[PDB]
Amino acid sequence: AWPKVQPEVNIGVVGHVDHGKTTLVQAITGITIKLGYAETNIGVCESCKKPEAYVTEPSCKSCGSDDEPKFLRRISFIDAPVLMATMLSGAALMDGAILVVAANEPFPQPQTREHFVALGIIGVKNLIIVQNKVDVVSKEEALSQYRQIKQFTKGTWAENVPIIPVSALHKINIDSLIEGIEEYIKTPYRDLSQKPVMLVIRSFDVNKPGTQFNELKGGVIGGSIIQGLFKVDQEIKVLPGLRVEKQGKVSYEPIFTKISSIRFGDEEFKEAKPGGLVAIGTYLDPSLTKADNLLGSIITLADAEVPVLWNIRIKYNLLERVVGAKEMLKVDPIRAKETLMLSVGSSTTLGIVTSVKKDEIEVELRRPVAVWSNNIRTVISRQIAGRWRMIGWGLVEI
């Protein structure tokens, strides 16, 4: 039999807005935290020819065997599908990505180029480009577009990213994409001695109306573990935590609790490791978690030492220019007193630039951020043409 395990890797699925990517995830996977999330086992029939040997079910009958296929791993997918903070937050969780382009449209469409740039900015370079709808174009046209994509990626960091033709709607060449995911989006090395850190992207009150008071469940926190591992009954804390206002005053107080349960999808586990979206039951007053109240927080063990900072120094890199409709837009150098949006983990905060140098800026934040490690990546955005746009990235320096 195949084991029942949590997913060990997260794969972003990004597309020009389309009828493509979601059906893609469904074509691979057959499918509370949501956000366009799906999991699937991946396996391979050892005595059979690739790529057809790749399977998502423990059967090799399709290649003429009654034997059980080898289990490789369980993977999860995160669908990109607007407000800027959301892609940034999703991007925080990805170990790799699939960029979906339509084979029957000129490459690259504006949104596609935007996506490519974005993927470069957020640091997600385990990439696969998927030519969707190749069944509506000839071999020759698909090859033409293939050549255009290679030409567009040449000289860039994505010069060698594979291009895989499929039809999501009609399920053509899906196994080649599964093979591609296995070869180009390997599960990263995990040092599980690292301090446990989880990014929170949802929080719920899971109690239904009419729930009897003595049967009330504590708040539930949904997120993505990025390092280390958590266990049921561990003492943890939520950082920066609870916003508290004394008259004419503001501050944040860590929220202490204990893990009551760990869940991936509909399977319960005793422990939770990086990979997949996890639901964590707590002993918290559900008021504290209700309606994504804790979105943008992190969770660590109670005794972890983690700086919570209202001012940060960032070693940064700006783009030369930003994709726009209908045109490319120049990126002005950072200026003091200007407002930027900074993405750190699953959080997004406005800040004022208090210092500008060539390689470093310093920023005063409207809300503090928990900085769990040195050189955490941050995404930098500026309001251009009345819309927040990613203009560069950096490392938070502590």
From Swiss-Prot:
Provide the binding site for Zn(2+). C45, C48, C60, C63
Q: Give the binding site residues for GTP.
A: D18, H19, G20, K21, T22, T23, N132, K133, V134, D135, S167, A168, L169
The record ties this protein, via PROSITE patterns, to: G_TR_2
Q: Which Pfam families match?
A: eIF2_C (PF09173), GTP_EFTU (PF00009)
tr-type G domain segment(s): 6-189
Q: Which residues bind Mg(2+) 2?
A: D18
Subunit-level organization: Heterotrimer composed of an alpha, a beta and a gamma chain.
Question: What is the protein name for this chain?
Answer: Translation initiation factor 2 subunit gamma
Organism of this sequence: Saccharolobus solfataricus (strain ATCC 35092 / DSM 1617 / JCM 11322 / P2) (Sulfolobus solfataricus)
